[PDB]
Structure formats: C-alpha cells, structure tokens
Amino acid sequence: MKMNPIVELFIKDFTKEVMEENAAIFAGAGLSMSVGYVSWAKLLEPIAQEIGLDVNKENDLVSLAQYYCNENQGNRGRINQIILDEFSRKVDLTENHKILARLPIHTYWTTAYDRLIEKALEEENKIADVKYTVKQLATTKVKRDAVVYKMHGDVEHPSEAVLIKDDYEKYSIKMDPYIKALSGDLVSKTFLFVGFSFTDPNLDYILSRVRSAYERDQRRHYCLIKKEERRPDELEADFEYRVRKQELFISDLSRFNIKTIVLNNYNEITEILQRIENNIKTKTVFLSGSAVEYNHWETEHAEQFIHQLSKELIRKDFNIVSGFGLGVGSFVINGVLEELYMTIDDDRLILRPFPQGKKGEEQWDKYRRDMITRTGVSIFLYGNKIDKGQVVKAKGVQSEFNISFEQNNYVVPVGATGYIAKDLWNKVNEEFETYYPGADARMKKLFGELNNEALSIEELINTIIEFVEILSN
Amino acid sequence: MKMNPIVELFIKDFTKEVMEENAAIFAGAGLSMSVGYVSWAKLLEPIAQEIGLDVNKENDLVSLAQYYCNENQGNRGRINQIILDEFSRKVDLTENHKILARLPIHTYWTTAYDRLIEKALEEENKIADVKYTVKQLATTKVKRDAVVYKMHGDVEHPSEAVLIKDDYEKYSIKMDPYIKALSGDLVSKTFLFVGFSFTDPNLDYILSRVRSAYERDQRRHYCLIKKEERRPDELEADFEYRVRKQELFISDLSRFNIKTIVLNNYNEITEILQRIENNIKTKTVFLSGSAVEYNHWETEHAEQFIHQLSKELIRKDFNIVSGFGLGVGSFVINGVLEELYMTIDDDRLILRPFPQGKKGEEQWDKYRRDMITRTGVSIFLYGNKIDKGQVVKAKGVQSEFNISFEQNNYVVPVGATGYIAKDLWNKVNEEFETYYPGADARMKKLFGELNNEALSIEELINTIIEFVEILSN
Numbered sequence: 001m002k003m004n005p006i007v008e009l010f011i012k013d014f015t016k017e018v019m020e021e022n023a024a025i026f027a028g029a030g031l032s033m034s035v036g037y038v039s040w041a042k043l044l045e046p047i048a049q050e051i052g053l054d055v056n057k058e059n060d061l062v063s064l065a066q067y068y069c070n071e072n073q074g075n076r077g078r079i080n081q082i083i084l085d086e087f088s089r090k091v092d093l094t095e096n097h098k099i100l101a102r103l104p105i106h107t108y109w110t111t112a113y114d115r116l117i118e119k120a121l122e123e124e125n126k127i128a129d130v131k132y133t134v135k136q137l138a139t140t141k142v143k144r145d146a147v148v149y150k151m152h153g154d155v156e157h158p159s160e161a162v163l164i165k166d167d168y169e170k171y172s173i174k175m176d177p178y179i180k181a182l183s184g185d186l187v188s189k190t191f192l193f194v195g196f197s198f199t200d201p202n203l204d205y206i207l208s209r210v211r212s213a214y215e216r217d218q219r220r221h222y223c224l225i226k227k228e229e230r231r232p233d234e235l236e237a238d239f240e241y242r243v244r245k246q247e248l249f250i251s252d253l254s255r256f257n258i259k260t261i262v263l264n265n266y267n268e269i270t271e272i273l274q275r276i277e278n279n280i281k282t283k284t285v286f287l288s289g290s291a292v293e294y295n296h297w298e299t300e301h302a303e304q305f306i307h308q309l310s311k312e313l314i315r316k317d318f319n320i321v322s323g324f325g326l327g328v329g330s331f332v333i334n335g336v337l338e339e340l341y342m343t344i345d346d347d348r349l350i351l352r353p354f355p356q357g358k359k360g361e362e363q364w365d366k367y368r369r370d371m372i373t374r375t376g377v378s379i380f381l382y383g384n385k386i387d388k389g390q391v392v393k394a395k396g397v398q399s400e401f402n403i404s405f406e407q408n409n410y411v412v413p414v415g416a417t418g419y420i421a422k423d424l425w426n427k428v429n430e431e432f433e434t435y436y437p438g439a440d441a442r443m444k445k446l447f448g449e450l451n452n453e454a455l456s457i458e459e460l461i462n463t464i465i466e467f468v469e470i471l472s473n
Numbered sequence: 474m475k476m477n478p479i480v481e482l483f484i485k486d487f488t489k490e491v492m493e494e495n496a497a498i499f500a501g502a503g504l505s506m507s508v509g510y511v512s513w514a515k516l517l518e519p520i521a522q523e524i525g526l527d528v529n530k531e532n533d534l535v536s537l538a539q540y541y542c543n544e545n546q547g548n549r550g551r552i553n554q555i556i557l558d559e560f561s562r563k564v565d566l567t568e569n570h571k572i573l574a575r576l577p578i579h580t581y582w583t584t585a586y587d588r589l590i591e592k593a594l595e596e597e598n599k600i601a602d603v604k605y606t607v608k609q610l611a612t613t614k615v616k617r618d619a620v621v622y623k624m625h626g627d628v629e630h631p632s633e634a635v636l637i638k639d640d641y642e643k644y645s646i647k648m649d650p651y652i653k654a655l656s657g658d659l660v661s662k663t664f665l666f667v668g669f670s671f672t673d674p675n676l677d678y679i680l681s682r683v684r685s686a687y688e689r690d691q692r693r694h695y696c697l698i699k700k701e702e703r704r705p706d707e708l709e710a711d712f713e714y715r716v717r718k719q720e721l722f723i724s725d726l727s728r729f730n731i732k733t734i735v736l737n738n739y740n741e742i743t744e745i746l747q748r749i750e751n752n753i754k755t756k757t758v759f760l761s762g763s764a765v766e767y768n769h770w771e772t773e774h775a776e777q778f779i780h781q782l783s784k785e786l787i788r789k790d791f792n793i794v795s796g797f798g799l800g801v802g803s804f805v806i807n808g809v810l811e812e813l814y815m816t817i818d819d820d821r822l823i824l825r826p827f828p829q830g831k832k833g834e835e836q837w838d839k840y841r842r843d844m845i846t847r848t849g850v851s852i853f854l855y856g857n858k859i860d861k862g863q864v865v866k867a868k869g870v871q872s873e874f875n876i877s878f879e880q881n882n883y884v885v886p887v888g889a890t891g892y893i894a895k896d897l898w899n900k901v902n903e904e905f906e907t908y909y910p911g912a913d914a915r916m917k918k919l920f921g922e923l924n925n926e927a928l929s930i931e932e933l934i935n936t937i938i939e940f941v942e943i944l945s946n
C-alpha cells in the first residue's frame with residue numbers, strides 16, 4: 001500500500017536527490033541498535049555502578065564516562081575494553097544496511113563504532129573507503145563507490161573513540177578536518193539523518209556553525225524520528241508532556257532546516273527505504289520480445305506500436321535496456337533515437353545484442369542475467385521466432401520472464417501482442433497475488449486491459465505507461 | 474570562632490592573592506538570588522505554560538526559552554520585557570556585594586543581568602567600569618578602580634542578554650572578544666567563583682579551551698559551592714545519590730584546576746568574605762600615643778621599647794600608620810627605618826603629622842578620622858602630654874580610641890605603658906565582650922598580660938605581637 005502524504009513527499013524528494021548522487025546518509029547509533037548490539041547505557045551500567053552511580057537515574061552518559069575516568073586518574077582502559085568487546089561482535093546485518101548499500105549513495109557519516117556499514121557495502125561488491133583518522137582524509141581509495149566518515153572513531157581503535165567529555169572538548173582541535181568536511185557536506189549534499197537523536201554536542205556545534213554561516217539559506221536536510229509511544233505503566237498527562245516535548249524538539253530541529261519525518265514504528269524505516277529503492281530500481285525497464293509475426297496487427301502497424309511505446313517510455317524519463325531481439329530491438333532503437341534526437345546518454349538506451357554463434361550461446365545465459373539485473377521492470381511483447389521454416393514460440397522470452405521473476409522484478413506481459421506474451425499474461429493472471437502482491441482495483445483493471453486485443457496502438461501504449469507508472473510510484 | 478581547615482587554607486591563599494591585586498571574582502546568578510530577585514525558573518514559569526511545558530519538569534531553561542522563541546517565529550519580546558521588568562527592580566544590596574566592593578579587587582566577571590555589583594562599587598566611592606558590549610572593550614574609564622565584565626548582557630539592554638540557545642550558539646562569533654578576555658583572565662588572574670553553577674555552555678567552552686591550551690599547567694582557581702541538603706520529603710537513598718553526584722561534579726571541576734570549597738550554608742559565604750576582608754583590613758595598625766613621661770621605665774628604656782615594637786611590627790609584614798605624636802612618633806619612625814633600610818614604600822610607613830596652629834586644629838578631627846580609617850587595628854601607648862607646666866592626660870589618645878571603636882577597629886590598649894592607656898585598658902577589660910566578642914582563653918590571657926607592668930621590653934613586645942597576630946588571623 002502507501003503511507004502518509006508527508007512521507008510520500010519525502011520519498012519523492014529523496015529519490016530525486018539520490019538519483020543525482022547528491023544525497024548522503026548520517027547514521028547514528030540507533031541504526032545499529034536493531035542489529036543486536038546492547039545500548040550504550042547498558043554498556044555503561046557496570047561502570048556507573050563502579051563509581052557509585054546508576055545509569056537508569058542518569059541522563060548524560062558522556063558525563064558518566066567522564067566521572068569514571070576522573071576516578072581512575074584519567075584512565076580509559078575499562079571503557080576501551082568494553083567498547084572493543086561489545087562492538088566487535090559477529091552479528092548479522094539488518095535490512096536497512098543492505099538497502100543503503102544497494103542505493104547509489106556515495107557518502108556516509110556515522111557516529112557508531114561498529115563496522116556494519118562497511119560490511120553492508122562490501123557485501124554488495126562495492127568498494128568502500130572508511131575514514132576515521134585525520135591522516136586518512138588525505139588519501140582516497142581508487143574507484144571507491146562510497147566513503148564512510150566515522151566521525152567518532154572505529155571499534156578496532158577504542159582509544160580514539162569519542163566516549164568521554166574530554167574527547168568532545170578536544171574534538172574541535174584534534175579532529176578539526178572532520179568538522180570542516182562535515183560542514184562542507186552539510187551545505188553541498190542533502191542528508192538523511194537515520195537513527196540519530198540530535199543530542200550529540202559535536203553535531204550541535206557543527207549545525208550551529210552552519211546556521212550562523214548561512215542563516216536562512218541553509219540546504220534542506222531530512223530526518224527520521226519515531227514518535228513517542230506510551231510506556232506500559234505511565235499516566236496520560238506525562239505521555240502528553242513527552243509528546244509535546246518531542247514536538248518542540250522536532251520544531252527546533254527545523255531551525256537548522258532539517259525536516260523531520262514522524263515514524264510510527266521503527267520498522268517503518270525499512271518500508272521507507274524499500275520505497276526509495278523501488279522508485280530508483282524500477283526507473284529502468286527491460287523491453288523483452290522477438291517477433292516474426294505480429295498477431296492481429298500488420299508488420300508496419302506493430303512496428304509503429306513498438307516505436308511509439310519506446311518513444312513514450314523514454315519521454316517519461318525511463319531507461320530502456322534491450323537485448324536487440326529480432327523484431328522489437330530495431331524498433332525500440334528507432335523510438336529511442338527519435339525521442340532523444342528531438343548524442344545518446346549511456347543511461348537512457350542500453351543495447352546488449354546477443355552474440356550469434358555456438359561460442360556465444362554458452363555465455364547467453366549469464367549475458368541475459370546481467371542485462372536483466374540492470375533493470376527493475378520487465379515488459380514482454382510477442383515472443384515468436386522462425387524455426388524449421390515455421391513460426392515457433394521463442395523460449396528466450398520465457399527465459400527472460402523467469403530470470404526477471406527470480407529477481408523480484410515487476411513483470412508486465414503485454415497479452416495483446418499475443419504468442420508467448422499471451423501465455424505469460426495468462427500465467428500471471430492465474431495467480432495474481434504471486435506476481436503483484438497487494439494490488440488495487442486500478443492495477444487489476446490495467447492488467448486485464450493488457451489483454452484487450454481490441455485496443456488501438458495509442459490506447460494500449462497508454463495502458464502500459466500507466467501500469468509502469470503506478471508500479472514505479 | 475574559626476571554620477574547617479580547608480576553608481582556612483583557602484582564606485589564607487585568597488587573602489595572599491587579593492593583597493597582590495591578582496585576584497578576580499566570577500559572580501553567577503546565585504550571588505543575586507539572595508537579594509530578592511526571583512529565580513530564572515520562576516521568571517520562565519509563565520513562558521513554559523504558554524507553549525504547553527512546565528518549568529518544574531524541565532531541566533534546561535535555555536532550551537525552554539529557545540522553544541518559546543521558535544513558537545513565536547523567533548521573537549523575544551516577552552522574554553526581553555520579563556527580564557527588564559524583573560532585574561531592574563529597586564532592591565537593597567546584600568552584605569556580600571558590599572564586602573566585595575570593599576575588597577581590593579580590580580576585575581569582576583558576571584553572568585547576571587542586574588547592576589548590583591555596579592551599585593555596590595559606586596556606594597564605596599569606587600570608579601567602576603562596566604563592560605557588556607564589544608565596542609566598550611576598546612575604551613577604558615580613567616582611574617577606574619574595578620572593571621565589571623558582564624559577559625551575558627545588561628538588564629537595560631534586554632535584547633542583547635544571552636537567554637536562549639541561539640544566543641549561546643552565536644556567542645562564539647558575536648562576543649568573541651569577551652571570550653578572549655576571559656581566557657586571558659583565567660590564566661593571568663586567580664578567580665573566585667561565587668554563586669556559580671558551572672552549567673553555563675559558554676563557561677564550559679572557555680574552560681575546555683583553556684585546559685586544552687595549558688593541560689596540567691593551568692592556574693589554580695577557587696570556587697564556593699553549597700553541599701546538597703536533604704529536601705523536606707525525600708528518601709535517604711536519593712539524598713545519598715544527590716550527594717554522590719555533587720561529589721563527582723566537584724571532582725570534575727578540579728579537572729580544570731578549580732578547587733571547590735564545600736559550604737554548609739549560603740550564609741557561610743558572608744562569613745568567608747568577612748574573614749578575607751579582616752585578614753586584609755587588620756594588616757595595617759595604628760600606633761597611637763604621646764608621652765612626656767614614660768611611667769616605670771626611663772625615657773631611654775621606653776624609647777627603646779617603642780623602637781623595637783615598631784621594628785617587630787614592620788618585620789611581621791604590618792603597615793604602620795602614625796600621627797607623629799610627641800614621644801612615640803619619632804621612635805616609631807626610627808624603628809621602621811632601621812627595619813626597612815636593613816627606600817621607603819608608601820604602604821609600609823605612613824606619616825601624618827598634625828598641623829600645629831589654630832588653623833589646623835579645626836581640621837584635626839577629620840585628619841584623625843582619615844588616618845584611622847586607613848587602619849584596621851589600633852595600638853595605644855602611654856598618652857600623657859605636658860600642659861600648664863604639668864603632665865596632664867592627653868585627650869587625643871582617647872579621641873583616637875573613640876574613633877577607632879566607632880569604626881569597629883580592634884583596640885589594643887597597652888596598659889603597661891600607663892596613663893591614659895591604663896584607663897583605656899581598664900575600660901576595655903570591664904566590658905570585654907563589647908570590644909572583643911567571642912574571645913578565647915589565649916586572647917584573654919594576652920589581654921591581661923598587657924597590663925603586667927613587671928614584663929620586660931621583649932616580653933611586652935612579644936605579647937603585643939602575638940595579640941595582633943591572633944587578631945589578624
């Protein structure tokens with residue numbers, strides 16, 4: 001289904017930002033607390049007991065750690081050992097980290113010591129450049145896909161982690177290049193603050209400096225904060241007081257032009273990220289098909305149909321990936337060229353002709369999987385081919401359909417074209433929840449109109465375009 | 474009586490600092506809360522109610538004011554009006570302000586908007602230079618006796634007062650010269666933080682910068698903080714938790730080399746300041762007397778006695794103010810010169826010969842009051858004068874005694890010298906609590922030994938010196 005209109009507007013804006021590679025993610029400690037790591041308060045629980053305090057009655061953990069260091073003549077051995085033992089455990093990644101790794105985001109700023117972001121980026125075969133030291137800023141990893149600025153330290157270097165109040169006090173001098181880099185990113189990139197509480201003194205100082213430098217012309221940043229929920233045993237008045245205090249905090253965040261999105265549940269973050277990826281993943285379509293006969297239409301009429309379909313797809317800011325199949329590939333190229341020339345960007349039209357010969361047939365399967373992996377939505381037209389002097393049904397269209405379905409791609413079999421596409425349409429229609437879960441009345445009507453053979457070229461193309469649009473957004 | 478040894482050590486050290494004019498006072502809002510001004514929380518009580526919050530449940534009043542400004546599109550009209558109406562009231566000064574005005578302190582740093590310090594300084598006929606604007610730093614008032622840096626703003630300029638979080642955020646840029654001046658004073662002068670909570674973000678930033686610049690070689694500063702007392706309805710465990718938290722806070726203060734003195738009561742501040750002034754006020758003695766006969770001793774023996782008494786007084790770092798009386802003034806001068814030459818500082822020996830003639834007798838009274846006002850302790854020797862060919866009792870010694878007593882000066886009538894000094898000794902002895910309240914056994918023994926005419930010169934001088942010492946400290 002869908003979400004609140006505010007969340008939908010945020011999704012549209014951030015998908016617009018990400019596709020231009022001008023988006024950054026600021027991940028706090030809260031993004032990793034769902035993985036399985038104990039909260040920092042629970043880590044400091046024995047430490048507070050040692051100096052005679054209690055974490056449950058303490059609001060400032062930084063001052064708690066500073067008191068612990070003061071008792072031990074400024075020694076951090078126990079704190080370093082605690083953070084090293086806790087944040088270096090072997091835990092499975094959450095879905096949020098994998099989604100963020102799949103997104104085309106080239107900048108991560110983290111206040112968490114764990115390497116979950118690095119691991120998520122490396123699992124997706126993305127070269128990630130982690131920077132948590134001043135000297136590391138002067139060197140850039142070659143062909144990096146994303147840079148993770150760990151602005152508070154790494155788990156493998158506990159002595160450098162910003163935990164106590166002296167660390168924050170000397171941060172402005174020791175880690176000044178990181179402050180300058182974050183100040184530059186907060187004005188040159190659009191941030192999405194996920195799992196961040198906005199209570200960090202370093203972030204307060206940096207944001208205040210940015211606001212003082214730019215006043216009302218600050219760049220718009222987005223934030224995700226869960227609304228306060230009533231505790232199991234609490235009066236109504238205190239819950240309303242907490243909600244009022246959270247509303248004031250959210251309004252105060254927008255002083256720095258950080259728009260806050262209220263989230264009912266923590267699991268809504270994953271649903272937002274999935275939507276953001278889907279609006280990007282489905283932006284590329286895969287025009288599958290091959291035809292020597294064109295069913296009810298004549299060859300010229302169907303060629304015009306395919307040409308205009310590709311022209312409309314390109315006109316609606318879609319990316320066409322075509323295998324240059326016999327009978328549809330040339331007309332797809334013609335439509336794309338007619339729309340574009342009214343040079344060719346490598347992102348708009350992607351041609352992958354299949355090598356002809358017994359040597360290329362062995363690599364055909366991986367070639368086709370590589371093609372389909374580039375796309376998010378698959379559209380199937382006709383699907384017959386000439387074999388043994390007869391118009392047989394082309395099994396490559398079926399193979400593409402199977403590969404796209406294995407990849408959880410949205411399949412749109414145009415049944416009006418006929419042949420193997422009609423069979424695909426019937427197969428999808430028999431079990432509609434399997435291929436299109438949670439569909440609406442409009443989606444079902446459009447799908448049932450895909451097999452309406454009495455439609456003209458324009459009506460069928462409009463049906464397909466509306467179907468792809470409601471799929472993408 | 475006396476106080477704890479820690480407080481006594483602080484008193485000695487700070488009196489040593491003040492007498493060298495290297496001491497400064499940092500007065501927070503708490504020093505004025507005893508005057509009659511309502512607390513800042515009570516001022517913000519209607520403001521919190523307006524935006525739906527409550528001050529009693531809020532710990533950060535700065536964020537409360539910032540929320541109030543955020544609700545009103547960043548307008549501070551109500552807050553400015555509130556602070557102007559509250560901190561500009563006509564209230565009587567406390568004793569602490571008057572004592573601080575009487576002390577030889579040339580630098581005051583204040584986070585309070587009220588003009589109580591200025592008023593206290595002006596009541597003592599001291600030229601005070603109040604600075605709360607950046608431009609005001611470039612101009613110094615001629616012959617100023619003390620400069621009051623109001624580092625948060627003045628009551629008469631409510632719009633410039635640092636009240637909300639935006640003010641603190643932009644303080645580092647707008648009021649940077651004040652930050653630099655306070656950083657210089659925190660390393661060139663010894664501070665006494667009275668009525669300050671050490672929760673101000675500006676002070677935290679400045680102290681952290683000073684510590685980062687100087688590390689373990691920071692100058693020693695002193696602080697006065699009241700120990701936590703149990704509330705009327707509170708469990709023992711929570712009170713012990715509060716005490717532990719206060720002890721940790723006090724220890725954390727010493728990270729910046731700020732030694733904290735624990736005070737049982739708020740009224741102990743006045744008792745500490747009175748002690749600090751008394752150790753400075755009593756450092757100057759007034760050798761009163763006049764002699765044509767020298768009682769039991771011969772003229773030469775008594776001249777040697779007075780000479781050695783003055784020599785011992787100067788040797789013990791006392792300041793002698795003498796009216797150049799007939800019979801003691803010359804020998805006081807001889808003793809002071811013999812001690813000093815073994816130039817003359819204007820503070821060690823102060824000579825005020827009385828103008829002889831009917832024109833000077835009319836101003837004699839104000840001259841004598843001016844002399845005695847310069848001193849803290851009065852010592853009386855002999856007191857006879859030749860009149861009508863006979864050795865009459867000199868009424869000027871009695872007049873000096875009366876003037877010193879009117880000024881609450883400690884009177885030490887040396888009864889062994891005799892004449893009007895014996896009468897003075899008897900008068901003080903008859904009602905001893907009137908002149909020496911709260912005396913000890915040692916003080917009474919020394920006073921009773923002042924009239925022991927069988928004492929030699931050395932024994933009598935040692936008695937007087939010990940008496941003056943136990944008076945001063």
Ligand SMILES: Nc1ncnc2c1ncn2[C@@H]1O[C@@H]2COP(=O)(O)OP(=O)(O)OC[C@H]3O[C@@H](O[C@H]2[C@H]1O)[C@H](O)[C@@H]3O
Pocket residue numbers: 287288289290322323324325326327353354356384385394395396397400
């Ligand atoms: N002389 C040729 N010149 C160029 N191209 C040729 C020739 N001869 C055949 N082709 C094309 O090769 C692909 C592999 O051949 P195929 O296995 O027979 O394909 P198919 O079963 O028709 O599947 C159809 C899908 O495959 C791809 O195009 C097919 C053929 O159209 C597309 O992605 C389709 O969407």
Ligand SMILES: Nc1ncnc2c1ncn2[C@@H]1O[C@@H]2COP(=O)(O)OP(=O)(O)OC[C@H]3O[C@@H](O[C@H]2[C@H]1O)[C@H](O)[C@@H]3O
Pocket residue numbers: 760761762763795796797798799800826827829857858867868869870873
């Ligand atoms: N030719 C003189 N040449 C110089 N000095 C003289 C002369 N003649 C008198 N004096 C002094 O004038 C002061 C006023 O005179 P007085 O009123 O008679 O004084 P006093 O009654 O003896 O009081 C004693 C106290 O006054 C002051 O010294 C006295 C006299 O000693 C001191 O402070 C004493 O401690």
